[PDB]
Design a protein around this ligand. Structure first.
Ligand SMILES: C[C@@H]1C[C@@H](O)OC(C)(C)O1
Ligand SMILES: [Zn+2]
Ligand SMILES: [Zn+2]
Ligand SMILES: [Zn+2]
Ligand SMILES: [Zn+2]
Lengths: 330, 331
């Protein structure tokens, strides 16, 4: 004698309970404190809850059982909101720590050691006074890392090594940010199998993606429905969503399957039910081109890949097996 | 007639000796709640703030204006707790300071006006506490977004009657552009305090604004890194001008006839996360009196320089009362 679980906003769950998992989503993309200070920007807090519950229930009916909400502190993560909508839609939600693209002064001024302590607090102790523990660490670059972003990448690697929770990233994929992120992570001793290089469907450079995957990284093809096709007269929507079709993004899933990387693909929508960190109309514009919301992956992408010949066992591997392996702490 | 505080409305007469530019905790939105251990704990910050407010109260202070905005990490529930425990009135602020997040930076002048009106007319967050002042900031020539903030502040002030108070880079004469923008919106100068005005020695700049009816915020009197020359971060923040140099600007404005335009404060805090990690400890070593520095140090200094007590009472009691009392709403 003397010689299994993932944290969600409702508490620990076993691996088997996660099921079909969307690995990069947002209940509400905002800013720290903003939902509490100005809920009327979203109509009301109650209206945002109702919208998220409706959308999550639709995703659940399409087969989704878990989402990973990769909103950080500076993306306005409100874990109490996540917990309310998770409960009322009966969909598990994994919450995130880390930092995204808009850290305030009180974060931007901190050392790598301080950031490590903050990420560890959110994983090991809880987020705010809620007792809800993060189950993933989110980081971001937008091209070459700023000095602070390098600190965040290192603190994320250290927090991952101390807890076993994985790291997921925002990239400027066309600037191959995953390469710099990988270099910094490996300089900290982090295993590539603990890292998802996200927004990787924003590029068509397959050689960039297969080289990362041949190093063991997971590849996040996570913005499949993001497209401004049909919105060409809308500059702000076009700038955010791009002019590449959802089908072009979905073809990358098949391409990576065909190149042997099915065990390293993670798929998602990068959808939201509220969105205050961009132009005012953006949520309504996005909803007008993708009414399916987070159900877009199961309702549209799965049939598209099935028509292309991808067998169901491969699709189950990508949507069930891969997220469970990634999220289970090492 | 009544001034909104974190404990509800108070009569103008209850405000008493008022410090018009202070902070319980200078932070970032959501930060105190997400990482209270940065301050030791929330409980430690409460105890420190209550002790510091009691020290100010024993020295005669009865009200402070906490000019922390949303993006400076204002936690009005913290303000209410410490105000009640220390029995010092606290007026809370709306507006935006120097660190707005994307969800604010992307907003139009109309949207910002709505947000400021929400915090004044409805309440801050879900607390029911209404803001009694609007805080805005520039650090040099205004950015396009800062111009929107100045205009929204003017519009919210005209609609509600609550005054406007500003952060300036005083040595770059920011108050002149702020005044121009406020006046283009029809805002009365007597409802505007041009803050951090003690950061400059240019009396011609200060007296010209005062002559136009602007209030002059000499609000950082104890900020000095004299003796801390080997500390670059403290030197950059606090400057190398003495508290006596800053205090003598109060006398200079009095001597030139502008007593009625003066407001005085410490610009102190009990927690501070938006700068380098040890700053609050360093500031506390410089000024253990905290917010009591104005009454315990500046008043006796000016008294012995010949400023009558009744003049100092007018500056610390009557001037803030006139500033904070809301004007009639437009229409
Ligand atoms: C809050 C999220 C972050 C990242 O996923 O980008 C989008 C535009 C989807 O907003
Ligand atoms: Zn992203
Ligand atoms: Zn995202
Ligand atoms: Zn200031
Ligand atoms: Zn201040």
């Amino acid at each position: 004698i003397s010689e299994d679980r993932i944290n969600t906003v409702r508490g620990p769950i076993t691996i088997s309970e996660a099921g079909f998992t969307l690995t990069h989503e947002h209940i509400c993309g905002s800013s720290a404190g903003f939902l509490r200070a100005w809920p009327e920007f979203f109509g009301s807090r109650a209206a945002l809850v109702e919208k998220a519950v409706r959308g999550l229930r639709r995703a659940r009916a399409a087969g989704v059982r878990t989402i990973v909400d990769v909103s950080t502190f500076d993306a306005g993560r409100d874990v109490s909101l996540l917990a309310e909508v998770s409960r009322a839609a009966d969909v598990h939600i994994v919450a995130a720590t880390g930092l995204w693209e808009d850290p305030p002064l009180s974060m931007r001024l901190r050392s790598v050691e301080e950031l490590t302590q903050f990420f560890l607090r959110e994983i090991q102790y809880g987020i705010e006074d809620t007792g809800i523990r993060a189950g993933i660490i989110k980081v971001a670059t937008q091209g070459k890392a700023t000095p602070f972003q390098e600190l965040v990448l290192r603190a994320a690697a250290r927090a991952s090594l101390a807890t076993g929770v994985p790291v997921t990233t925002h990239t400027f994929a066309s600037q191959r940010d995953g390469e710099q992120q990988a270099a910094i992570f490996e300089s900290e001793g982090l295993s590539p199998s603990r890292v998802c290089i996200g927004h990787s469907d924003d590029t068509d450079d397959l050689s960039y993606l297969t080289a990362l995957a041949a190093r063991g990284y997971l590849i996040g093809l996570d913005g499949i429905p993001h497209s401004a096709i049909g919105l060409e007269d809308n500059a702000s929507a076009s700038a955010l969503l791009g002019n590449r079709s959802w089908q072009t993004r979905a073809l990358l899933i098949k391409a990576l399957i065909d190149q042997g990387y099915m065990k390293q693909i993670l798929v998602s929508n990068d959808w939201l039910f509220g969105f205050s960190s961009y132009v005012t109309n953006i949520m309504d514009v996005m909803d007008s081109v993708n009414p399916d919301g987070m159900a877009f992956i199961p309702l549209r992408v799965i049939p598209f890949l099935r028509e292309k010949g991808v067998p169901q066992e491969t699709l189950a591997g990508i949507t069930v097996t891969n997220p469970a392996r990634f999220l289970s702490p090492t």
